[PDB]
Design a protein around this ligand. Structure first.
Ligand SMILES: O=P(O)(O[C@@H]1[C@@H](O)[C@H](O)[C@@H](CO)O[C@H]1O)O[C@@H]1[C@@H](O)[C@H](O)[C@@H](CO)O[C@@H]1O
Length: 490
């Protein structure tokens, strides 16, 4: 079989699947591991955006009541080191010890804040396990299909510990670990003992090429089979080569900028709001995205299903109100830094250059500060920074509650003093079933989010890849690459 060569924007600092949650980790850990339930993006001929959930490590499952789901595990599934998958591995994956309890904070810093209100799993037998929540949760199934729920081997993971496991991962997935050179490459090889569709590449190499121009050159020269994280300005050149093409899709993620609200100038909402109200998103979408990016009506996305609000108004744009907020905030004209890891995010620096000019027109002076991969700056040296959030559930709970809620990092680490009402609503939507009360609570949370501006949503990126026409592979509407029954050569 052909070896697959990928030129990527970046690499995660660990292959521990929860710590690898980012724009760059899932395309790798999706190959090493499996989940109990998987999303089939290609269900019923869909162009990589189907919402259908299908059996994966769980052959079947059944919701018992408002807070428990029983899973019947596929038998004779082997981890890469030979160990057979059992309910004990699944129980460990979703345990207090490894994932969501207080002891897990050191190993998986965001484990607890991104998890449901789990109770300890119950192992019924070697192939039967029940996942439970202490309080009602109708999100167990969507959680279990998500990037939080890749199944790790209990004994091997405990032996190494989360850090060393992150450098030598073992999973049940179609590709097994070969090597990891931090900040340079990850190499995987075919797991020919895979339980599902057999791997079609002999090897996969994820080679970091941080500068997108160099990545495009690598595809043109024949060094890479597929490249990631391009902008729509690269489409015409790549498609001019008869043996190459672009493959793009709008993904269930939003780009944003956010603030270190421990900094004096951002403790209060006024200047955060001034900066938010001066962003002309449609002009950025036209200039940098060739109309392909999508601007959402607040923290509100169609993948939320029953908790998506299609009637919501656009996020405000008001240059004159922004000018008045700069004056009322007492802002004295001092430059404010905005950190970016180059173009880790497609259009990060071009968007920042536009926003710097928009902010100059309201009297705020912003300056770019770049940081290298793996060297995220110290928190107290950051003021503004760019970020993104993958919308990882078929529900509005994610990402507003896990990221911006009372137990989340935006309030605890980055100092957002959220109104008490916002936190009360976060607690309510966590346990309520779908209905008018829950739907209205998310809309009020969205309104407070826009009023407070702890972050400023820019748009959903149009994720552009480029590939050799002789490498058959279709993108999916999420920040990952799927190769199961979706990778062939010739
Ligand atoms: O690639 P990202 O946008 O964010 C990562 C961030 O996690 C990491 O600290 C930083 C330094 O290496 O690099 C990127 O900015 O990944 C986010 C993730 O942080 C978030 O938890 C998830 C759900 O909201 O969405 C991702 O897109």
């Amino acid at each position: 079989r052909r070896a697959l060569r990928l030129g990527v924007n970046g690499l995660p600092n660990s292959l521990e699947p929860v710590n690898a949650i980012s724009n760059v980790g899932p395309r790798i850990v999706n190959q090493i591991f499996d989940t109990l339930i998987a999303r089939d993006f290609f269900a019923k001929g869909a162009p990589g955006n189907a919402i259908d959930l299908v059996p994966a490590l769980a052959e079947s499952w059944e919701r018992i009541d408002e807070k428990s789901v029983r899973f019947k595990l596929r038998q004779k599934v082997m981890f890469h080191d030979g160990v057979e998958l059992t309910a004990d591995d699944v129980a460990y994956t979703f345990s207090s010890e490894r994932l969501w309890g207080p002891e897990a904070i050191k190993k998986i810093p965001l484990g607890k804040s991104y998890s449901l209100d789990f109770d300890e799993p119950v192992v019924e037998d070697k192939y039967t396990v029940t996942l439970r929540t202490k309080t009602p949760s109708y999100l167990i199934e969507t959680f279990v299909a998500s990037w939080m729920s890749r199944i790790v081997p209990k004994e091997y993971y405990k032996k190494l510990g989360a850090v060393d496991f992150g450098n030598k991962p073992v999973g049940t997935g179609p590709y097994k670990f070969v090597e990891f050179v931090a900040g340079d490459r990850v190499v995987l090889e075919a797991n020919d003992a895979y339980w599902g569709p057999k791997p079609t590449a002999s090897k996969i190499t994820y080679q970091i090429v941080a500068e997108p121009a160099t990545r495009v050159a690598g595809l043109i020269s024949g060094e890479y089979d597929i490249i990631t994280t391009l902008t729509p300005d690269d489409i015409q050149l790549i498609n001019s080569y008869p043996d190459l093409e672009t493959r793009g899709t709008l993904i269930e993620n939003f780009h944003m900028f956010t603030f270190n609200m421990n900094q004096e100038v951002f403790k209060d909402k006024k200047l955060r709001r001034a900066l938010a109200l001066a962003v002309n998103r449609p002009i950025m979408v036209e200039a940098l995205w060739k109309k392909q990016a999508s601007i959402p009506a607040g923290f509100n996305f169609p993948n939320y299903g029953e908790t998506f609000d299609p009637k919501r108004k656009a996020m405000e744009y008001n240059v004159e109100e922004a000018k008045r907020l700069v004056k009322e905030s007492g802002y004295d004209g001092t430059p404010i830094t905005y950190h970016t890891m180059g173009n880790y995010y497609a259009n990060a620096m071009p968007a920042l250059m536009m926003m710097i000019e928009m902010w100059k027109q309201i009297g705020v002076n912003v300056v770019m500060k770049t940081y290298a991969p793996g060297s995220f700056p110290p928190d107290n040296q950051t003021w503004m920074r760019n970020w993104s959030n993958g919308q990882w559930m078929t529900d509005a709970y994610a990402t507003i509650v896990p990221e911006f809620g009372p137990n989340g990092q935006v309030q605890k680490r980055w100092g957002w003093k959220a109104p008490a009402e916002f936190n009360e609503l976060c607690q309510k939507v966590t346990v309520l079933p779908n209905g008018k009360e829950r739907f209205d609570a998310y809309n009020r949370m969205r309104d407070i989010f826009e009023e407070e501006a702890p972050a400023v949503i820019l748009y959903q990126p149009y994720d552009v890849y480029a590939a050799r026409k002789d490498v058959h592979w279709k993108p999916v509407s999420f920040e990952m690459m799927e190769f199961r029954n979706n990778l062939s050569f010739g």
